[PDB]
């Protein structure tokens, strides 16, 4: 009964780990000798956006590299303007605790989600001026951690009750539900083609999903502690995870192995947020050692320090055009960088 | 480029309207005190929050005491894991920690003591004070009369404990129950003092979950926390 199933599971695990060991031929560092270092990237704050009361726990860029939304745990949701540091909307929330936001790709909708277990959708059409909550999406029993828009009419949400949904804003009902994790899902990033989305969970495991069928395709177990942040490579065929074990790691969706890991001796603290750039050469990585950081996807070596904050950095989003690099700390302050 | 000056002025009008909308909520956010209510489920936690009153993840609770506003964020339908959604509770004024002194299927004081140990040493909670409520103190009166009770075996260090002289128990009870009661407070104070950080302090209290003085105790300890926090940046403490 239970013993036979456990033996079958452990034999399958042995086979899987042996197959993964078979895929390994050489380390990524060896074949990257010709890759020159990017050098010391002296980055300086171009603009700084005062206006948030309490810590910013998440923020998103618009699809035109101009407007950015920034969630705060003070009960606000500010829609900035990176060009002129102007506030074009300051829409409040009915739940004080906000753990994630999202800016719709069309630039017409916004989302939010936190401990209230409801993923409010804000409509910026404004046929009457004042924004409205177009739909509240309920059905989760844990707590929302990251919601991103597939398109104008499909929003995927991650919850802490080991469940990823995929809603439908037209009708407000789960099209499909993704189960199979063990702990707390807390970060997912959609693909550049918006076909699949990864999902890291606090059990130190990532699981590529799919939005058509609804079944996990590949899984990854490389981290030794709860995962914190995750994204995609600009090509969409790789993704870097960062977990609270003071390590960063990189994956591939077809190699199924830790292609190249990043670490150093002096780091003894975890990582809070992660993002790439569009050339796939600058892994920007917001650490909890009171400063952001940058690494190289092909060098695994230091390239710059974005030290301007006074607490952790919980959000770090490079812009779509690649022109600027926002950042936001628990110091309730938001900065914009542009290397010059 | 004369078609942009009007739009720039309109955007400035929107920006100044928004800053006006935010500077008024400045004071609203800085006025209230955020209190995180926490503890084991099998305690009188729900009774405490119901007294404070007189599906969602977080149950709000607003109340005024001496014309200061308290937001009490009782945790609602959530999972047992606390490692993650506690990290966002670091701006709270204090963490009310309601623990039941039920020394019985499984021991509650050791699990709650371990949970307080995890709360105390957390990296982001090194600056948030904790307010201890030792509930069900009256139950110890009826629990110590069983003879070979659960108070002397699961904690053999109580077998040779001498009650402090400076501690004056509630009059009307035998010294034995006072000993068995102050023992738990000593168990908690051992860790609450052994950390030595000095940036955050505990506050032990005894309550029976049915009285008006719970809210008064919360308000007094919050005022004390605020006073010590103000003294902190003056290097007076």
């Amino acid at each position, epitope marked *: 009964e239970l013993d036979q199933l*456990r033996q079958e599971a452990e034999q399958l*695990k042995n086979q899987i*780990r042996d197959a993964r060991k078979a895929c390994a031929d050489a380390t990524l560092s060896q074949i990257t000798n010709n890759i020159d270092p990017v050098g010391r990237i002296q980055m300086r704050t171009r603009r700084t956006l005062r206006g948030h009361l309490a810590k910013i726990y998440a923020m998103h860029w618009g699809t035109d590299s101009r407007l950015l939304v920034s969630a705060s745990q003070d009960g606000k949701l500010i829609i900035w303007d990176s060009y002129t540091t102007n506030k074009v909307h300051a829409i409040p929330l009915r739940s004080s605790w906000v753990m994630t936001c999202a800016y719709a790709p069309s630039g017409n909708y916004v989302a939010c989600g936190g401990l209230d277990n409801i993923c409010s959708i804000y409509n910026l059409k404004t046929r009457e001026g004042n924004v409205r909550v177009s739909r509240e999406l309920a059905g989760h029993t844990g707590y929302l951690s990251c919601c991103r828009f597939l398109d104008d009419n499909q929003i995927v949400t991650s919850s802490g009750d080991t469940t990823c949904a995929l809603w439908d804003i037209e009708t407000g009902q789960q099209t499909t539900t993704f189960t199979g994790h*063990t*702990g707390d899902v807390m970060s997912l990033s959609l693909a550049p083609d918006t076909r699949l989305f990864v999902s890291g969970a*606090c*059990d*130190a*495991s990532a699981k590529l999903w799919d939005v058509r069928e609804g079944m996990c395709r590949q899984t990854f*177990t490389g981290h*030794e*502690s*709860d995962i914190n942040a995750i994204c995609f490579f600009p090509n969409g065929n790789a993704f870097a995870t960062g977990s*609270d*074990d*003071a390590t960063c790691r990189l994956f591939d969706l077809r190699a199924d192995q830790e292609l190249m890991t990043y670490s150093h001796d002096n780091i*003894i*603290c975890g990582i809070t947020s992660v993002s790439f750039s569009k050339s796939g050469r600058l892994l920007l990585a917001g650490y909890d050692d009171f400063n952001c950081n940058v690494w190289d996807a092909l060098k695994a070596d230091r390239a710059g320090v974005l030290a301007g904050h006074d607490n952790r950095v919980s959000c770090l989003g490079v812009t779509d055009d690649g022109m600027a690099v926002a950042t936001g700390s628990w110091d309730s302050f938001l900065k914009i960088w542009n290397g010059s | 480029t004369e078609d942009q000056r009007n739009e720039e002025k309109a955007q400035r009008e929107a920006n100044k309207k928004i800053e006006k909308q935010l500077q008024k909520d400045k004071q609203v956010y800085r006025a209230t005190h955020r209190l995180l209510l926490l503890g084991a489920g099998e305690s009188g936690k729900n009774t405490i929050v119901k007294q404070m009153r007189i599906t969602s993840g977080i149950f709000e609770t607003k109340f005024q005491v001496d014309k200061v506003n308290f937001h009490m964020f009782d945790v609602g339908a959530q*999972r*047992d*894991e*606390r*490692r993650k959604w*506690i990290q966002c509770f670091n701006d709270v004024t204090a963490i009310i920690f309601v623990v039941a002194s039920s020394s019985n*299927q*499984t*021991n509650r004081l*050791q*699990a709650a003591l*371990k*949970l307080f*140990d*995890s*709360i*105390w*040493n*957390n*990296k982001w909670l090194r600056d948030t004070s904790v307010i201890l409520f030792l509930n069900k103190q009256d139950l110890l009166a009826e629990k110590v009369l069983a003879g070979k009770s659960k108070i002397e*075996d*699961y*904690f*053999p*260090e109580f077998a040779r404990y001498t009650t402090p002289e400076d501690a004056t128990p509630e009059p009307g009870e035998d010294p034995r129950v006072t000993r068995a009661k102050y023992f738990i407070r000593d168990e908690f104070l051992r860790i609450s003092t052994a950390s030595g950080d000095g940036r955050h302090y505990c506050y032990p209290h005894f309550t029976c979950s049915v009285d008006t003085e719970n809210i008064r105790r919360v308000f007094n300890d919050c005022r004390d926390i605020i006073q010590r926090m103000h003294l902190r940046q003056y290097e007076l403490l």
Partner: nanobody
């Protein structure tokens, strides 16, 4: 993948002797504190005894102190819990629990059904 394995056990008379050994792989053993969590039949998960990175601080549940002792040895990459001087009221499944947070003495989840970094444990039965 983080894994834990446990051994030991077997029928022992009350007041006898026993030892429980914990094997870990997939992570560095020095960083994390390690403790023992035993579940008695039909009961919730109970906590027994913990050892920190080196072994400077060792603590016990009162019902277990005076008879059991713990040991940690980073070089052997294993954890020890000596289990002599038995009582007929502690027959249980043992889980060599790991705390997830490295380089710190504060971590929450240890005693829960939904925790991930715990082993299948070993059954320890004590009877006449």
């Amino acid at each position: 993948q983080v894994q834990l394995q446990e051994s030991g056990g077997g029928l022992v008379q009350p007041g006898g002797s026993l030892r429980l050994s914990c094997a870990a792989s997939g992570f560095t053993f020095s960083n994390y504190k390690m403790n023992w969590v035993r579940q008695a039949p039909g009961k919730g998960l109970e906590w027994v005894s913990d050892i920190s990175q080196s072994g400077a601080s060792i603590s016990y549940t009162g019902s277990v102190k005076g008879r059991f002792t713990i040991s940690r040895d980073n070089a052997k990459n294993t954890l020890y819990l000596q289990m002599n001087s038995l009582k007929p009221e502690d027959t249980a499944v043992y889980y060599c629990a790991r705390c997830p947070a490295p380089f710190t003495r504060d971590c929450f989840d240890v005693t829960s059904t939904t925790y991930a970094y715990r082993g299948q444990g070993t059954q320890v039965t004590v009877s006449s």
